[PDB]
A and B are shown apart, each in its own frame.
Chain A
Amino acid sequence: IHCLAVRNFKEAAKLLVDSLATFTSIELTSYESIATYASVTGLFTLERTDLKSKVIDSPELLSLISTTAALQSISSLTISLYASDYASYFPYLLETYANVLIPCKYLNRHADFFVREMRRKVYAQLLESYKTLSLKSMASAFGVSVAFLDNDLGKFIPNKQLNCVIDRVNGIVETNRPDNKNAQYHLLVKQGDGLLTKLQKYGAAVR
């Protein structure tokens, strides 16, 4: 819960997301609540391979499918991601956002930005599979607009979240290799101002 504001989410995948007790702890949280945060956060941290090896592997999910279907994220976000279908994944964003993220007691503060990130990640992973793809070929059947699709992707460039090939006026769309000798050297640049912070700080009176 404390990592939900920092948005680390990695240390909570094997602790908060992975629950040893099938039924909740009462005074801490709720049975439907502890099973809801496992699916929401698990899709952001655990990859698609770990979805079938962990989420459905745990017996806690099998008991939720045959009892409470009100979450709607078990038959929507899980199937659309496993099948890599963006056409069906788009309309389930708001339906889940309304019945999960809005009633959510933690992540309801910052929501729309958290959804827009995972919205492209489903399509970003599919981009690695195909080499050459036009703009209007399969995107017209996905039920989305071309203008709004480029607006969200255009703002992700300064965040260093796009190494790939995305084009609009022409429409030739390819994939790239984020592992190279550029980001390999980026580790040293990021540590430039963070390593010398405390070295020149306490070295005034002492040393």
Chain B
Amino acid sequence: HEKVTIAPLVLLSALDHYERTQTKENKRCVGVILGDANSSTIRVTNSFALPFEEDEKNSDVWFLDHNYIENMNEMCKKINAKEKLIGWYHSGPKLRASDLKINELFKKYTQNNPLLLIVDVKQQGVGLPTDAYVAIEQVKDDGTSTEKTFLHLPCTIEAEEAEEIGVEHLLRDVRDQAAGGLSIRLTNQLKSLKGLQSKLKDVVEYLDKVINKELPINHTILGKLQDVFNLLNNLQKALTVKTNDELMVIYISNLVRSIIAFDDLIENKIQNKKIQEQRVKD
């Protein structure tokens, strides 16, 4: 399986360049990743910055240096020669279509499979706004043509021995790692549903886009939204007879053994009673 693992320094290195040149509001900052991967698994650790500029009115305006930016990789080659160019990362807040046209220029200098990440200047979402792209030829059922498109894959943040405790040493404020972490994650799971519910509000706007003037309709999106009914809701009521019994067994074994282990603290009164007998010298 292809799983992109991103180092958090990539987000911090680009965050500095967003403040310096004041790059934001539909302005993409192009960058390149680094690592050694001969397998499908992609490991992203070090990253560079490409001085890219674009126009907001014209999405076809792009300028990228080929061998002038690779001097940073030549300087890093003498540092670490094990890692080479495995891909590249962009910003794309509105996801410009310039990356769809040419997949060759970025693949010429990267011998690995084509990979395109997303680093926004905002990245303030509680969810997982960081997304990965794989550019291949995929068959489309929309009825137009089969061409190179983006393939989405899940990614995450890398933690190694260097930066694991380094970030925790900087924060050292709110951690709270215990059995009580269920209330934080399950609430975030509810926020994940509410986060997708906010994405469903964009689906509400998707119909308004059809209501708008001269916009097409994507047939691929309709295929996924068509099965939302027959899948998973009074249809499941027939299976709720044997399903509720499985949830009750969890409560049966839990409540009988939960009141046992808590009865071993009786020694508190026993030790406190012996303290009064030790008061002869007190």
Contact = CB atoms under 8 A, between A and B. Distances in A.
A188 B245 contact: no
Interface in A180-207: 181, 185, 188, 191, 199, 206-207
Contacts of B269: 206-207
Nearest to A191: B256
B266 A206 contact: yes
B257 to A, nearest CB: 12
Interface string B251-272: 0100010000001001001000
B74 to A, nearest CB: 72
Q: DSSP majority for the A interface?
A: loop
A207 B245 contact: no
A206 B265 CA distance: 12
Given A188-B252, A188-B256, A181 B266 contact: no
Contacts of A188: 252, 256
B266 A207 contact: yes
A200 to B, nearest CB: 12
A199 B266 CA distance: 11
Contacts of A191: 256
Nearest to A203: B266
Nearest to B256: A188
Q: DSSP majority for the B interface?
A: helix
A185 B266 CA distance: 30
Nearest to A199: B263
Interface string B58-69: 000000000000
A65 B245 CA distance: 54
A199 B256 CA distance: 14
A181 B252 contact: no
Interface string A52-71: 00000000000000000000
Nearest to A181: B245
Nearest to A185: B252
Nearest to A205: B269
Contacts of A207: 266, 269
B172 to A, nearest CB: 39
Contacts of B245: 181
Nearest to B268: A207
Contacts of A181: 245
Interface in A115-156: none
A46 to B, nearest CB: 32
A3 to B, nearest CB: 28
A206 B268 CA distance: 10
A207 B263 CA distance: 10
A152 B251 CA distance: 40
Contacts of A206: 266, 269
A181 to B, nearest CB: 6
A158 B202 CA distance: 64
A185 B249 CA distance: 9
A123 B64 CA distance: 92
Contacts of B252: 185, 188
Nearest to B270: A206
A191 B255 CA distance: 13
Nearest to A202: B266
Interface string A156-192: 0000000000000000000000000100010010010
A27 B206 CA distance: 97
A87 B269 CA distance: 67
Interface in B267-282: 269
A199 B263 CA distance: 9
8 shortest interchain CB distances as A-B pairs: A206-B269, A207-B269, A207-B266, A188-B252, A181-B245, A188-B256, A206-B266, A185-B252
10 contacts: A181-B245, A185-B252, A188-B252, A188-B256, A191-B256, A199-B263, A206-B266, A206-B269, A207-B266, A207-B269
Interface of B: 245, 252, 256, 263, 266, 269
Interface of A: 181, 185, 188, 191, 199, 206-207
Given A199-B263, A207-B266, 6 more contacts: A185-B252, A188-B252, A188-B256, A191-B256, A206-B266, A206-B269
